[PDB]
Design a protein around this motif. Structure first.
Motif, PDB file in Angstrom:
ATOM      1  N   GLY A 176       0.735  -1.367  -0.082  1.00 31.43           N
ATOM      2  CA  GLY A 176       0.189   0.080  -0.023  1.00 31.43           C
ATOM      3  C   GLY A 176       0.943   1.203   0.019  1.00 31.43           C
ATOM      4  N   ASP A 211      -6.501   0.803  13.863  1.00 32.43           N
ATOM      5  CA  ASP A 211      -5.178   1.564  13.558  1.00 32.43           C
ATOM      6  C   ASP A 211      -5.944   3.083  13.395  1.00 32.43           C
ATOM      7  OD1 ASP A 211      -3.264  -0.221  13.751  1.00 32.43           O
ATOM      8  OD2 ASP A 211      -2.940  -0.303  11.664  1.00 32.43           O
ATOM      9  N   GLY A 263       6.732  -1.067  11.500  1.00 33.53           N
ATOM     10  CA  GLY A 263       5.539  -1.544  12.068  1.00 33.53           C
ATOM     11  C   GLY A 263       4.340  -0.929  11.761  1.00 33.53           C
ATOM     12  N   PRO A 264       4.207  -0.593  10.483  1.00 29.08           N
ATOM     13  CA  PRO A 264       3.243   0.464   9.999  1.00 29.08           C
ATOM     14  C   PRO A 264       1.854   0.246  10.316  1.00 29.08           C
ATOM     15  CG  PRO A 264       4.216  -0.619   8.171  1.00 29.08           C
ATOM     16  CD  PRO A 264       4.321  -1.505   9.380  1.00 29.08           C
ATOM     17  N   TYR A 265       1.318   1.557  10.932  1.00 29.92           N
ATOM     18  CA  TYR A 265      -0.131   1.632  10.986  1.00 29.92           C
ATOM     19  C   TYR A 265      -0.839   1.457   9.717  1.00 29.92           C
ATOM     20  CZ  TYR A 265       0.803   3.638  15.558  1.00 29.92           C
ATOM     21  OH  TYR A 265       1.197   3.732  16.997  1.00 29.92           O
ATOM     22  N   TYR A 266      -1.972   0.623   9.486  1.00 30.73           N
ATOM     23  CA  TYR A 266      -2.642   0.484   8.416  1.00 30.73           C
ATOM     24  C   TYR A 266      -3.815   1.584   8.373  1.00 30.73           C
ATOM     25  CZ  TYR A 266      -0.164  -3.967   8.177  1.00 30.73           C
ATOM     26  OH  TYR A 266       0.949  -4.615   8.127  1.00 30.73           O
ATOM     27  N   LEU A 291       0.446   4.877   4.163  1.00 28.49           N
ATOM     28  CA  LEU A 291       0.491   4.341   5.557  1.00 28.49           C
ATOM     29  C   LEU A 291       1.836   4.614   6.180  1.00 28.49           C
ATOM     30  CD1 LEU A 291       0.695   0.404   5.393  1.00 28.49           C
ATOM     31  CD2 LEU A 291       1.939   1.984   3.815  1.00 28.49           C
ATOM     32  N   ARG A 306      -9.504  -1.139  25.277  1.00 31.42           N
ATOM     33  CA  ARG A 306      -9.092  -1.079  23.738  1.00 31.42           C
ATOM     34  C   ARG A 306      -7.670  -0.673  23.842  1.00 31.42           C
ATOM     35  NH1 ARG A 306      -8.305   1.220  18.892  1.00 31.42           N
ATOM     36  NH2 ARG A 306      -6.601   2.630  20.094  1.00 31.42           N
ATOM     37  N   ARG A 349       0.548  -5.685  18.868  1.00 28.23           N
ATOM     38  CA  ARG A 349       1.839  -5.431  18.148  1.00 28.23           C
ATOM     39  C   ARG A 349       2.960  -5.955  18.897  1.00 28.23           C
ATOM     40  NH1 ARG A 349      -0.739  -1.470  15.451  1.00 28.23           N
ATOM     41  NH2 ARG A 349      -0.871  -1.553  13.106  1.00 28.23           N
TER      42      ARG A 349
END
Lengths: 65, 202, 204, 213, 197, 214, 201, 123, 220, 202, 197
Positions: free
Chosen positions: A52, C58, C100-103, C125, E85, E93
C-alpha cells in the motif's frame, strides 16, 4: 487464481473464495506486475516495501538482477 | 565483471572492465573498478557494488589511520589482512571478492586474492569476477615468470579483452594500473586500443 | 488485503474559500456489518479535520496519538496548528512506525489560520504526503471516487456547489463498493461556520 | 513454466438508447509499463446492427473475434439469415463457457439494436455470465466510469430530477467526457477514442483524440 | 465457538453468554461463566483463545479495581472500555498478543446504560446490541428485526430467548444453557439461566 | 518451450517510403555467455516478406523450416497466388496462439516486414499470440531503448526515406550496443522494397567511449 | 447473494437479491437470480453466476426434451436429480453452484436444494448464499406452514431485506416469485431503498 | 469389427431379415395377454412337456420390475437378452428419475432396441 | 517516474516528471520529485516515496548543520557519503534511489545512489521506470561541455521520452539548473500534456442531494 | 566433460576427456565419448549419459538405414539434421549437447554444434561440456585459419589439457580422432603425453 | 460430523443414525434419512462426503435390486457387504473415489442377523456392534461396557438410548434426533424416533 468465482458468494466460510462475477482485475491478478528490485544492481530484502505504500520502480520490467 | 592483477619484478599491474549491470541493462558502462586504498595499494572489486564500496572505504579509513600512527608506509599484506578480516567477519552479510595488489619497500610487488568467504592467499597473478572463468586456460597457458611491466600490461589487456568478448556482464573499456616504487601509472584502453581477436567464420 | 478488512472511504475537496471532508459510516468485519455510525473524521482544530481510512483499530490509535501530540503542541506553542504543520506531524508519526506500519491513510482538510486558505492533503500508510489542489481520496473504493471527482470537480466552487459535488461523488462511489456505505457524513469548513450533514444513502 | 495471460489494457463503453446503440473504446495497446501501439481499436463490427467491444488479453480478443466472425458466417449459411443481437449474445455466452476451465481473458460488451429497433447492450464476464444493460463500462477504467454513468445516465442519488430519455447527441457528449476523465486518471486509457454508433441507418464511426501520456 | 450477546435498553443493559467450555469434540464444562465483574456496574464478557481470555480479563479487572482503590471512585464504562481497547491494541503488536473478543456492558450514573463491542484487533464500537461468535450470524438479523430503542427488560428477555431458540434450532453446535445478567442503576443482577433441556 | 536455451536479443523494424527495414544482431546467447556470434536471426520468407525473431533460436529455426516449406508448396502450386506479409503475420499469430493454448509455447518474439501492392507492412507477434501492426517495432530491450527514438522521429516526421530509416536504425543499434548486456556489435540489416528482400551484414556501429575520461 | 425459498399451504415462495460482486467492486445491482427454467420450474443463483446460468439452462433443455419424449412434464425431484447428476461429474474442478429447484408436480409443492458439492436434499425452507444466515434467522422466527399469501410475501421480503442489511455481498432489489399449482408468477421487484423506507419508517 | 449390412432393402420395398424374424416369431409358442379392469393376465402355451423338464427354468413369463412384466414368443435366447436389457433399463431409470418406469416407457425402450438391431451393421 | 540529470560545461541540470501513481491509477498530476538538499545541491528521488522524502530531509538537515559548523558551502561528496553510508547500514530496507547533483568549490558533480548503498559518479544518469528511454535519448544526443540551454533541451527531451513511452510517467517536466553563480528551479518547465476540453456538461446543481440531518456550528 | 572439434582443410579433428562423474565420485575415468555415427562421421556427447547414448544409437540406426537406401555415403549435414530433429523434438525430456564432425566427399570436413534445446549451427570449431567454459579465451586467441591436421591435433590437445586442469568434472586421458578421406585415425594421450602447463608459484 | 450406530442381537440388528444435514454452521435439514433399503432384509447406512454418499449408496441399491430382479432371490447380507466392499475398493484407486463410511445391517434366514463395518478405505469387518463418526469415540466404550451377546431388543433400545444420551451430554455437536430401525426375520421395522427436546 486470477479466475476464481463463487467461493465467497456461496458462504462466509470455507477455503473457497470469489464473488458472483469473474473479474481478474478486481481480484488478485498480477496485471502489470513489477519486481521491487527492477532497475537495481541487487535484490531488495523481503518486506522492504510495505504493501500500500507509494512506490516508484527503479527501472522498467526486465531490469531485475 | 572481470578483474586481473599480475605481479612483475618491480611491482604489479591491475586491470578491470567497466561494465555495471542491473540484470541485462548496463547501468554504468564506464565504471572504475580499480580503487586506490593507499598511495601504492589498489584493490579490484567484484560482487555486490555496495558491499565492495563500503569495505573498500572502511579499509582505506583503517589503513590511513594505521599508517599515520606508525609513520611508515603500509604493507600490502596489511591491507590484504584488513580486507580479509572484514570479509570473513561478515561473510554471511557481504558478497565481495577482492583482489589486493600493490608495492612494498619490504616486499616489492604483491598480489593478494580475497574471494567470497574471507580467505586470503598470495598469488603470482589473480583473476576474479564472472568473466574470469572464460580466461583461466588463457592465463594458464600464457603466463610466464620474469615478465616485464610492458609484457604484464599486454598480458592483462589481452586476457581482459577475451573475457569481455565472451562474458555478457563484462565490457566497456579496459582500465589498467601499474604500481611500482616511482608511483602509479593509470591508462584506459577503448575503441581500437583494446586488443582485437578475429571471430572465426565459415 | 489488510486495508480492506474493515472497509471505509474518506474524501476531501477544495472550494473557493472552503474545504469539504466526507466519509462513509459503516463499521464492519470482512463482509459483516457491526455498526453504522463509526467515526472516521476527527477535528484537529477549529477549522482543521483529519479523516482516516483503513484498519479501524489503527484509525482509532492514530487519531488518539495525534490528539495527544496536537494537544501537547498547542499547549507549548500557545497557538493553533497550521494544516501543513499537522500534515508534517502526521507524516512523522506514521514514519516512526516505518517497519511496524499503522494501516491507515489519513486525509487532512482545513483552512490555514489567519489566512483561511483551503488546504487538503493525503498520506500513505508510512507517511508520504500528497498535497493536491482539487481532491484527495482514500479507502477501498479509490477508483470510483477518482472517477466521480475527476468528472465533477470544478475550480472555485462555492460551499453549496462544493457540498453537492462531494456528496454526489461520495454517494455514487460508495454505491459501487461492497464494503463501503451505510451512510455518508459531510463536513463543510468555512471561515465563519462549519456545517455537518448526514446524507440519505443506501443501506444495503 | 510460463504465464499464458497478459493484461493489455483498454476500456470499452456501451450506451443503449431509444433507437441507437453506442460502443466506444480507446485505441491504446500496452503491456506492463510499455505501449505496444497507439492505434488499436477494441470495437469490431459483427453485423449491420451489432458491434462488439473486447478488452483484456489481446491474443484472446483476436481469437474470440475471429471465432465470432466464423460462427456468424456459419449461422448465416445454415439458417439463411443474419444473427440478431440477442442470438449473438447467447452464442457468445456458450462460446465463453466452452472454455470454463481455461477462460478467455476478455471483457466483452455487445452493443446493437434488438428486433424491435431499440438499442441493446449486453455485458459479459470472461466465462460467459451476461445480462442486458442500458449502459455498461468494461476494462481497466470500468470501475472509474461505471459510477459516473450511474449518476448521469441512471440519474441515481439525484433528487428532484426528471428521467429524460437519452438523446444521441447527449450520449456522445457523455461518452467523450467520461473517456477524457478516464484518460486523466487511468494509465491504460489514451491516445484516441473510437466511437461506433449503431442506428437503423447503419454503423457510424467517430474518432476523438486523447492525451498521449 | 462461544457465544456472547448484549442488548441495551433505555435504562439497562442485558447480556448473556454460553456456559460451555469445550476441548476437541468434548464439552468439559457445562456451567462455565464467561462474565468478569469489572466494577459494581461494569461487566466484561470475553471469548477467544484458551488462556488469553482469562489472562487479559483478569489483568483488566485488577487494573480497574486498582483504579477504584486508588481514587475512591470507579471508572465509567466508557473509560473502562477505552482503557481495555488501549491495552488490547498495545498488546496487538507486542510479543504477547491476546486473541480475545470482548463485550463491555456497563451503567453510568450520568451517561446511563452502555454496551461496547471489541474484536480481537481492538477496534471499539458502541452499539445498541451486539453479538460474538458464529451464533452472531444467526441472531443479529433477529435483533435487527425486533429490537427497538425503547424495549423494556421483559421484552428484552423475550427477544434474547428468541435469539437463543434460533441458536437451538439452526446452530450446529450444542449450546444448551446460557447465563443471563442485567445491569441497571442498582448494579448487576443475575437472572435465571436460560436452558434448553 | 518452457525454458529457452540459446536466445537472440532485440529485433528492430521501421517502415519508410517504399519498403521496410529490419535489424537484428548476429549473437546467440547461452544465458550470459555470448556463445554463437555468427548466426542470422533474419529470414527471407518470399520475395515480399522478411522475418526477424527474438528468443529461443531453436524455435526460430523450427519456424524457419515450417515457413519455408509452406512457401515452397505455394510456389509448387503455381496458381499465381502468393502469401502476402499480412497472411504470413496472421498465420504466425495463429501458430503462436495455438502453441500457447497447449501450454507449449514457441519462445519467440517475431517482427514481420513486407512490401506488397505498393503498401508497407510491419507486424509483431509474440509467444502469447499478441499481434499488431505499427510503423516501428522493437522487441526485447529495444522496446525500452530503441522504440522511444523511433517513435520520436516518426512523431516529428511521419514519413521517412530509405536513407533516413537506415541511419535511424543504425543509431538505435548503437544505443542497444551501449545499454544492452546481451547484445553484440555485429548485426544485420534487411530491407524489403519493390525489388525484393535484401540482407546486409555483418555491420558494426561506430562507438564513442570519451565519457570514460570524465 | 441471498436466496430463500419455503413451502407453505399455498405453494412455494422464492425470493432473492440482485447484487453481483467482483471482489469489493459491485459489478451489477440488477442480476436476475431467480431462473425461470420453464413455466412450472424455478431455479436460484448462488455462487458462480455463469455456472448456475449455464447448468440450469442445460436443465431446462433436458426438461423440455423429457416433456417431448414422455408427453408429460418432469417432476421437481427428477429435475433436481438430473441437475445433481450433471454437476457431480465436475466435482473438485472449481464449479461454484448453490441452487434451489422449486415447482409443483403430482406430489404437491416441491423444494430441493442442489449444490455443486453434491448435496441434494428436499426440505420445507432453504436459504443459500453469503447472507443466508440472516435470512434464516428472520425466516425461522417468521415462518409458519399456515401463512397467508400476503404474509408469506412480507416474510420473504423482510428476510431478504435483513440479509442485505447485514451482508456486504447482498443488496440491490428483492425479486419475489410464487410457485402455484398452475405455474409460478412473478410477484414483485422491490428496491432495497423502498423496503428500507417501508420498514424503518 | 464385423460391419456387414445384414438388413437391407429389396426391390419390392421390403426388409427381408425383418420378415424372416417375424416368421421365426410365428414358430413360437402362443402367448395371450388380456387387459382387465383391475387385473392383467398373461398366458403362454407349452409346446411340449417331457415329464422330466424343470418347469421353473422354462418360464416364458418374467417380471421386468415390481410393476411391469412381459411374455414373449420366438427365440428364447434373444428374448432372454432383451429381458436382461429391459431389467437393467428399469433399474437405471429408477436410479436417474427416482420413480418406477411406466409400461409405455419400457415398451418404447424395447422397441427402440429392436429397431436399432434392424438398422445397424453386422447384426 | 522519469528522473534524469546531466553535467554541462558550467553546472548541473536535473529533470523529472510530475506524475505519481498508486498501482495503475494516477494519484497526483503535479508531484515535486526534485528535493532541496543545500542551496547548491539538489536531489531527484525514486523508489519508496516516503523513504526518499525522509532520507533527503535528514541529509539536508545534517548538511545544514555541517555547513553552519564549518561556515563553508556544502560539498556534493559529503552528501553522497552521508547518503551512501546511511543506505548501506540499513541493507536496502530504506528503498530510496536518488540522482544527486550540485556545484561546489570543485565544480559540478552528479551522482546516482541506490538503496543498498552503491553510488556512481557519471556525467549523466537516469532513474525510474522511464529511465531507459531517457538513457536512450542521452546516449543518442549527449555531448560533453554543453551550454546551459542545450543541456536544458536535452534533459527536457529525455524526460519527454520517459513521459511518452512509460506508463508510470506523465504530466509536466520539472527542471533544476545549478551553476556556481545561480540556481534555477523551473516548475513546470514544459506542459506537454493537458486535459481535453469538455464536449458537454454534467448535472450538478443545488438541492440535488437529499439530507437527513444538518448541524451548523458558528465559529466566532 | 570437455569435448572439442576443429575443422582443417582435409577433414576434422575431434577430442574429448574421459571422466564420468556421479557427484564428486569418478565412476568411469576412461570413458570413450567419441562415438562413430558412420564410417567418416563422429559425435561428441555431453550432458546426460543415457540421453546422449540413446540419441546416438537412434541416429546411427537411422543414418545406416538411410545410407543403405540411398546407396551413397551419408552427409555430415544429414547426421547433424537427424541429431537436431531428435534433440529439438524431445528438448523437454533430454539433456544432450552434441557436436557432430566428419568428412564429406561433397562438403569436406564439417563441424556442427547441436546444444541443449535442439538448434543446429556449423562452426569452424566447437567446444562443449562443463569444462569448455574455461578455454573460450584460449581457443579465441589461439585458433587461426589454415591449420594443418597436426596443428589442429596439437591445438585440441592443448585446449583439452587446460580444461582438464581447471575443470573438476573433466580429466583422465585425452582421446583424439582425426577424420579425413583416407579414414579415421584415433589416438589416446595419457600421462606425460598430455600437454603440461606449469602452475604459477610464489 | 454425522453419527451411525448398529447393535446386533441374537435374532435382530438394531441401527440408528442422526437426521441432521448441515452446511457450514447451519443445519439445513432436521429430518434427514441416512439409511438405504437394499432389500427386504438389508439396510445400508452411509455417511461421508457430500454427493459421494448418495451416489455410491444408490449405485449399490440399484445393483442389489437388479440382482433380485434377475435371479428371483435376494442377495444375502454377507454377499451384499462383500459386493459393496469390492465396489468401494475398485473405486478407491480409480479416478473418482468415494469418501463414504458404511454400516451394513441385514438378516439372513440361515446365517441370522449380521452387522458390517466399512471405512472409506473399503476394509470390511463383522462386528457385534459398531459406530461411525466423532460420536463413536464417546459411545463405543458404553457399548463395550454394557453389551451382552444375548441382549434382547428392549435392552438394545435402552443401550442405544444411553449412547444417545451420552452424545447429548458430552458431544459438542447438536444431534437432537435419531431415526431408529430394526431388522429381524419379519423384515425392516421403523421404530420411534429417539428425540431430545
Amino acid at each position: 487464481g486470477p479466475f476464481v468465482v463463487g467461493g465467497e458468494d456461496l458462504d462466509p466460510f470455507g477455503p473457497r473464495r470469489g464473488g458472483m462475477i469473474v473479474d481478474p482485475l478486481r481480484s488478485g491478478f498480477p496485471r502489470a506486475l513489477i519486481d521491487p528490485s527492477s532497475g537495481l544492481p541487487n535484490r531488495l530484502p523481503p518486506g522492504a516495501v510495505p504493501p500500500g505504500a507509494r512506490f516508484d520502480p527503479f527501472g522498467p520490467i526486465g531490469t531485475s538482477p | 565483471t572481470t578483474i586481473m592483477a599480475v605481479q612483475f619484478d618491480g611491482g604489479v599491474v591491475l586491470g578491470a572492465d567497466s561494465r555495471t549491470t542491473t540484470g541485462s541493462y548496463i547501468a554504468n558502462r564506464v565504471t572504475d573498478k580499480l580503487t586506490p586504498i593507499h598511495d601504492r595499494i589498489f584493490c579490484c572489486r567484484s560482487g555486490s557494488a555496495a558491499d565492495t564500496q563500503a569495505v573498500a572505504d572502511a579499509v582505506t579509513y583503517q589503513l590511513g589511520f594505521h599508517s599515520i600512527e606508525l609513520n611508515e608506509p603500509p604493507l600490502v599484506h596489511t591491507a590484504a589482512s584488513l580486507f580479509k578480516e572484514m570479509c570473513y567477519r561478515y561473510r554471511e552479510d557481504l558478497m565481495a571478492g577482492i583482489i589486493i595488489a600493490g608495492w612494498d619497500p619490504q616486499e616489492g610487488g604483491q598480489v593478494y586474492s580475497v574471494p567470497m568467504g574471507g580467505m586470503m592467499v598470495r598469488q603470482p597473478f589473480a583473476i576474479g569476477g564472472s568473466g574470469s572463468s572464460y580466461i583461466y586456460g588463457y592465463v594458464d597457458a600464457t603466463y610466464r615468470e620474469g615478465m616485464t611491466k610492458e609484457e604484464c600490461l599486454q598480458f592483462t589487456a589481452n586476457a581482459l579483452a577475451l573475457a569481455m568478448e565472451r562474458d555478457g556482464s563484462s565490457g566497456g573499456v579496459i582500465r589498467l594500473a601499474a604500481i611500482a616504487e616511482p608511483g602509479v601509472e593509470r591508462q584506459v584502453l577503448l575503441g581500437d586500443q583494446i586488443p582485437k581477436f578475429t571471430i572465426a567464420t565459415l | 488485503s489488510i486495508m480492506s478488512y474493515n472497509g471505509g472511504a474518506v474524501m476531501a475537496m477544495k472550494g473557493k474559500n472552503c474545504v469539504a471532508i466526507a466519509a462513509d459510516r459503516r463499521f464492519g468485519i470482512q463482509a459483516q456489518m457491526v455498526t453504522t455510525d463509526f467515526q472516521k473524521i476527527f477535528p484537529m482544530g477549529d477549522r482543521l479535520y483529519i479523516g482516516l481510512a483503513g484498519l479501524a483499530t489503527d484509525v482509532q490509535t492514530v487519531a488518539q496519538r495525534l490528539k495527544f501530540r496536537l494537544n501537547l503542541y498547542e499547549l507549548k506553542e500557545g497557538r493553533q496548528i497550521k494544516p501543513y504543520t499537522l500534515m508534517s506531524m502526521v507524516a512523522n508519526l506514521l514514519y516512526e512506525k516505518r517497519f511496524g506500519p499503522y494501516y491507515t491513510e489519513p486525509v487532512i482538510a482545513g483552512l490555514d489560520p489567519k489566512t483561511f486558505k483551503p488546504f487538503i492533503c493525503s498520506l500513505d500508510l508510512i507517511g508520504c504526503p500528497m498535497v493536491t489542489d482539487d481532491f484527495v481520496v482514500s479507502g477501498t473504493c479509490t477508483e470510483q471516487m477518482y472517477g466521480m471527482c475527476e468528472s465533477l470537480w470544478e475550480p472555485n466552487m462555492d460551499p453549496e456547489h462544493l457540498f453537492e459535488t462531494i456528496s454526489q461523488a461520495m454517494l455514487n462511489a460508495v454505491d459501487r463498493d461492497a464494503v463501503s456505505g451505510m451512510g455518508v457524513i459531510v463536513h463543510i469548513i468555512e471561515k465563519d461556520k462549519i456545517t455537518t450533514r448526514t446524507l440519505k444513502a443506501r443501506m444495503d | 513454466r510460463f504465464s499464458p495471460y497478459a493484461f493489455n489494457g483498454g476500456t470499452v463503453l456501451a450506451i443503449a438508447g431509444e433507437d441507437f446503440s453506442i460502443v466506444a473504446s480507446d485505441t491504446r495497446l500496452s503491456e506492463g509499463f510499455s505501449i505496444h501501439t497507439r492505434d488499436s481499436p477494441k470495437c469490431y463490427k459483427l453485423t449491420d446492427k451489432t458491434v462488439i467491444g473486447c478488452s483484456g488479453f489481446h491474443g484472446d480478443c483476436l481469437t474470440l473475434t475471429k471465432i465470432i466472425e466464423a460462427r456468424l458466417k456459419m449461422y448465416k449459411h445454415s439458417n439463411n439469415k443474419a444473427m440478431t443481437t440477442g442470438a449473438i449474445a447467447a452464442m457468445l455466452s456458450t462460446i465463453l463457457y466452452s472454455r470454463r476451465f481455461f477462460p478467455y481473458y476478455v471483457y466483452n460488451i455487445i452493443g446493437g439494436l434488438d428486433e424491435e429497433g431499440k438499442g441493446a447492450v449486453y455485458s459479459f464476464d470472461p466465462v460467459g455470465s451476461y445480462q442486458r444493460d442500458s449502459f455498461k463500462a468494461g476494462g481497466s477504467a470500468s470501475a472509474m466510469l461505471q459510477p459516473l454513468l450511474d449518476n448521469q445516465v441512471g440519474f441515481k442519488n439525484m433528487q428532484n430530477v426528471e428521467h429524460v430519455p437519452l438523446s444521441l447527441d447527449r450520449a456522445m457528449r457523455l461518452v467523450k467526457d467520461v473517456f477524457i476523465s478516464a484518460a486523466e486518471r487511468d494509465v491504460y486509457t489514451g491516445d484516441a477514442l473510437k466511437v461506433c454508433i449503431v442506428t437503423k441507418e447503419g454503423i457510424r464511426g467517430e474518432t476523438v483524440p486523447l492525451r498521449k501520456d | 465457538m462461544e457465544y456472547l450477546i448484549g442488548i441495551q435498553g433505555p435504562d439497562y443493559v442485558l447480556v448473556a453468554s454460553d456456559r460451555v467450555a469445550a476441548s476437541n469434540i468434548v464439552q468439559m464444562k457445562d456451567d462455565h461463566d464467561k462474565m468478569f465483574k469489572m466494577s459494581e456496574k461494569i461487566l466484561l464478557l470475553c471469548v477467544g483463545e484458551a488462556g488469553d481470555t482469562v489472562q487479559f480479563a483478569e489483568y483488566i479487572q485488577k487494573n480497574v479495581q486498582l483504579y477504584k482503590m486508588r481514587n475512591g471512585y470507579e471508572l465509567s464504562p466508557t473509560a473502562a472500555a477505552n482503557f481495555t481497547r488501549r491495552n488490547l491494541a498495545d498488546y496487538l503488536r507486542s510479543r504477547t498478543p491476546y486473541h480475545v473478543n470482548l463485550l463491555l456492558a456497563g451503567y453510568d450514573e450520568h451517561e446511563g446504560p452502555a454496551l461496547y463491542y471489541m474484536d480481537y484487533l481492538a477496534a471499539l464500537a458502541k452499539a445498541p446490541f451486539a453479538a460474538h461468535g458464529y451464533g452472531a450470524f444467526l441472531t443479529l438479523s433477529i435483533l435487527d428485526r425486533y429490537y427497538t430503542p425503547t424495549i423494556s427488560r421483559e421484552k428484552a428477555v423475550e427477544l434474547l430467548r428468541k435469539c437463543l431458540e434460533e441458536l437451538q434450532k439452526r446452530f450446529i453446535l450444542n449450546l444448551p444453557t446460557f447465563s443471563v445478567r442485567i445491569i441497571d442503576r442498582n448494579g448487576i443482577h443475575d437472572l435465571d439461566n436460560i436452558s434448553f433441556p | 518451450t518452457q525454458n529457452p536455451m540459446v536466445t537472440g536479443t532485440s529485433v528492430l523494424g521501421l517502415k519508410f517510403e517504399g519498403g521496410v527495414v529490419i535489424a537484428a544482431d548476429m549473437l546467440g546467447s547461452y544465458g550470459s555467455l555470448a556463445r554463437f556470434r555468427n548466426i542470422s536471426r533474419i529470414m527471407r520468407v518470399n520475395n515480399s516478406t522478411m522475418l526477424g525473431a527474438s528468443g529461443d533460436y531453436a524455435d526460430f529455426q523450427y519456424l524457419k523450416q515450417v515457413l519455408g516449406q509452406m512457401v515452397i508448396d505455394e510456389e509448387l502450386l503455381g496458381d499465381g497466388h502468393s502469401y502476402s506479409p499480412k497472411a504470413i503475420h496472421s498465420w504466425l499469430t495463429r501458430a503462436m496462439y495455438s502453441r500457447r493454448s497447449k501450454m507449449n509455447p514457441l519462445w519467440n518474439t517475431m517482427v514481420i516486414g513486407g512490401y506488397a501492392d505498393g503498401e508497407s507492412f510491419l507486424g509483431y507477434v509474440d509467444m502469447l499470440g499478441v499481434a499488431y501492426e505499427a510503423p516501428s517495432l522493437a522487441t526485447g530491450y529495444g522496446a525500452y531503448l530503441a522504440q522511444p527514438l523511433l517513435r520520436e522521429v516518426l512523431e516529428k516526421q511521419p514519413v521517412l526515406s530509405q536513407t533516413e530509416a537506415r541511419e535511424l536504425v543504425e543509431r538505435c543499434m548503437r544505443v542497444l550496443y551501449y545499454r544492452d548486456a546481451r547484445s553484440y556489435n555485429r548485426f544485420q540489416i534487411a530491407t524489403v522494397t519493390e525489388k525484393g528482400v535484401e540482407i546486409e551484414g555483418p555491420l558494426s556501429a561506430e562507438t564513442n567511449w570519451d565519457i570514460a575520461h570524465m | 447473494t441471498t436466496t430463500l425459498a419455503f413451502k407453505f399451504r399455498h405453494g412455494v415462495i422464492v425470493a432473492a437479491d440482485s447484487r453481483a460482486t467482483a471482489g469489493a467492486y459491485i459489478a451489477s445491482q440488477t442480476v436476475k437470480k431467480v431462473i425461470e427454467i420453464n413455466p412450472y420450474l424455478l431455479g436460484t443463483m448462488a455462487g458462480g453466476a455463469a455456472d448456475c446460468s449455464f447448468w440450469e439452462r442445460l436443465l431446462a433443455r433436458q426438461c423440455r426434451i423429457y416433456e417431448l419424449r414422455n408427453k408429460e412434464r418432469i417432476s421437481v425431484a427428477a429435475a433436481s436429480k438430473l441437475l445433481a447428476n450433471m454437476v457431480y461429474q465436475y466435482k473438485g474442478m472449481g464449479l461454484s453452484m448453490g441452487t434451489m429447484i422449486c415447482g409443483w408436480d403430482k406430489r404437491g409443492p416441491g423444494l430441493y436444494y442442489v449444490d455443486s458439492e453434491g448435496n441434494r436434499i428436499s426440505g420445507a425452507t432453504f436459504s443459500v448464499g453469503s447472507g443466508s444466515v440472516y435470512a434464516y434467522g428472520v425466516m425461522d422466527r417468521g415462518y409458519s406452514y399456515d401463512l397467508e399469501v400476503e404474509e408469506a410475501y412480507d416474510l420473504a421480503r423482510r428476510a431478504i431485506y435483513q440479509a442485505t442489511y447485514r451482508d456486504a455481498y447482498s443488496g440491490g432489489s428483492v425479486s419475489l416469485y410464487h410457485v402455484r399449482e398452475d405455474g409460478w408468477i412473478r410477484v414483485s421487484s422491490d428496491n432495497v431503498a423502498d423496503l428500507h423506507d417501508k420498514y424503518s419508517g | 469389427s464385423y460391419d456387414r449390412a445384414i438388413t437391407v432393402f429389396s426391390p419390392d420395398g421390403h426388409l427381408f431379415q425383418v420378415e424372416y424374424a417375424q416368421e421365426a416369431v410365428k414358430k413360437g409358442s402362443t402367448a395371450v395377454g388380456v387387459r382387465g379392469k383391475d387385473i392383467v393376465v398373461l398366458g403362454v402355451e407349452k409346446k411340449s412337456v417331457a415329464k422330466l423338464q424343470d418347469e421353473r427354468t422354462v418360464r416364458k413369463i418374467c417380471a421386468l420390475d415390481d410393476n411391469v412384466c412381459m411374455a414373449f414368443a420366438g427365440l428364447t435366447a434373444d428374448a432372454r437378452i432383451v429381458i436382461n436389457r429391459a431389467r437393467v433399463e428399469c433399474q437405471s431409470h429408477r436410479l436417474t428419475v427416482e420413480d418406477p418406469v411406466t409400461v409405455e416407457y419400457i415398451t418404447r425402450y424395447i422397441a427402440s432396441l429392436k429397431q436399432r438391431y434392424t438398422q445397424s451393421n453386422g447384426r | 517516474t522519469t528522473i534524469a540529470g546531466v553535467v554541462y560545461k558550467d553546472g548541473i541540470v536535473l529533470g523529472a516528471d510530475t506524475r505519481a501513481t498508486e498501482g495503475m491509477v494516477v494519484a497526483d498530476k503535479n508531484c515535486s520529485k526534485i528535493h532541496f538538499i543545500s542551496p547548491n545541491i539538489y536531489c531527484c528521488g525514486a523508489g519508496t516515496a516516503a523513504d526518499t522524502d525522509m532520507t533527503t530531509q535528514l541529509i539536508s538537515s545534517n548538511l545544514e548543520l555541517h555547513s553552519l559548523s564549518t561556515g563553508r558551502l556544502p560539498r556534493v561528496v559529503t552528501a553522497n557519503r552521508m547518503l551512501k553510508q546511511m543506505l548501506f547500514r540499513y541493507q536496502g530496507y530504506i528503498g530510496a534511489a536518488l540522482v544527486l547533483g550540485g556545484v561546489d568549490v570543485t565544480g559540478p558533480h552528479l551522482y546516482s545512489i541506490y538503496p543498498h548503498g552503491s553510488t556512481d559518479k557519471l556525467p549523466y544518469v537516469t532513474m525510474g521506470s522511464g529511465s531507459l528511454a531517457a538513457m536512450a535519448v542521452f546516449e543518442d544526443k549527449f555531448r560533453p561541455d554543453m551550454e546551459e540551454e542545450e543541456a536544458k533541451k536535452l534533459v527536457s527531451e529525455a524526460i519527454a521520452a520517459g513521459i511518452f513511452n512509460d506508463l508510470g510517467s506523465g504530466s509536466n517536466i520539472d527542471l533544476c539548473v545549478i551553476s556556481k553563480s545561480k540556481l534555477d528551479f523551473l516548475r513546470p518547465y514544459s506542459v506537454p500534456n493537458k486535459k481535453g476540453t469538455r464536449f458537454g456538461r454534467y448535472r450538478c446543481e443545488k438541492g440535488t442531494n437529499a439530507v437527513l440531518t444538518e448541524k451548523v456550528t458558528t465559529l466566532e
